[PDB]
Amino acid sequence: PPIDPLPSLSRLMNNGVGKGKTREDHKQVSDQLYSAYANGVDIRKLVAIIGEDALTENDRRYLQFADAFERFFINQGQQNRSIEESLQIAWALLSMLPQGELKRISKDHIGKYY
Amino acid sequence: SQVSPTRMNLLQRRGQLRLAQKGVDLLKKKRDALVAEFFGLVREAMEARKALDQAAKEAYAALLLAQAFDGPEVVAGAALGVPPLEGVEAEVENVWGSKVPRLKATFPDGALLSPVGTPAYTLEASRAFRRYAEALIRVANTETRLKKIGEEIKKTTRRVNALEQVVIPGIRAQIRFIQQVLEQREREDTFRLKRIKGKIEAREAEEEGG
């Protein structure tokens, strides 16, 4: 399915969700996925404008997250994913970003799933 | 704050599409020419470079422990140093891909003319200076050509990228916005005209009734 969340904006995102009302890290992994993709797609703008690049090495990791979120996650065919399977593996793509550069998720959750 | 008018703006925005699309068409094949020829210079560059790099060094490296006291002798017979302020011959040239200057490395340095010293090596080292000079001209033109073709490439990808986002659909949405508001205005026209009709008939319906 092609879903693009960047022009997407929902009314509630912490209501009907929270610790034990969905999963404890549902509430945490919300805002995280959002700003993470953002800073990927952003680069691909500026690359044409000057040279053939527009990135360092601290940009290059957010770069691969716009490929990672892509055909792995967004694509799935029509297969039914479970609320577990979703956020679980959403933390295997978040291993490619520095954990010391995360500011949209709390630290006590870093220690629960890495 | 700043919003576009409809009646005044219309005529500008229709010719906007005429101007843009045609301009960019030929802009396209403008740089294409220049990069095709550029391959030719980069390849050809290194031809002389492999040949003369090795035959320069041939003698150099074989005159290091027979030199360091025959250094004196070799520099004496030979033609004195190239000037540090413009010893090379700089050329200015205006060309597309901005005004980039070029240059050719030819200067005097002599050849086969140092008197006294090591029988073979001295003279062979002096001659070798030529194989710096000459060889260096190739890289003298391609590394300056590199900076020119940088400008082009970057501006090229810039315009394409840009066009498909802000410009093109934006120059569209302007006609569209205009259009729709011109169009919708003409609901009030018809509605008013309706009530006008109603009056007219109502008047000829007081001759024949009430």
From Swiss-Prot, chain A:
Family to which this protein belongs: Belongs to the ATPase alpha/beta chains family.
Primary role: Produces ATP from ADP in the presence of a proton gradient across the membrane. The V-type beta chain is a regulatory subunit.
Protein name as annotated: V-type ATP synthase beta chain
Organism: Thermus thermophilus (strain ATCC BAA-163 / DSM 7039 / HB27)
Protein encoded by which gene: atpB
Covered range of the whole protein: 350 to 463 of 478
Curated annotation (Swiss-Prot), chain B:
Transmembrane regions listed in the UniProt entry: none
Keywords: ATP synthesis, Hydrogen ion transport, Ion transport, Transport
Cross-referenced Gene3D superfamilies: 1.10.287.3240
Molecular function GO labels: ATP binding; proton-transporting ATP synthase activity, rotational mechanism; proton-transporting ATPase activity, rotational mechanism
UniProt entry tagged with the keyword Magnesium: no
Pfam families associated with the record: ATP-synt_D (PF01813)
Biological processes, Gene Ontology terms: proton motive force-driven plasma membrane ATP synthesis
Superkingdom as given in the UniProt entry: Bacteria
Similarity remark: Belongs to the V-ATPase D subunit family.
Functional summary from the UniProt entry: Produces ATP from ADP in the presence of a proton gradient across the membrane.
NCBIfam families: V_ATPase_subD
Classification via HAMAP family: ATP_synth_D_arch
Name recorded for this polypeptide: V-type ATP synthase subunit D
UniProt organism field: Thermus thermophilus (strain ATCC BAA-163 / DSM 7039 / HB27)
Highest classification ranks of the organism: Bacteria, Thermotogati, Deinococcota, Deinococci, Thermales
Gene: atpD
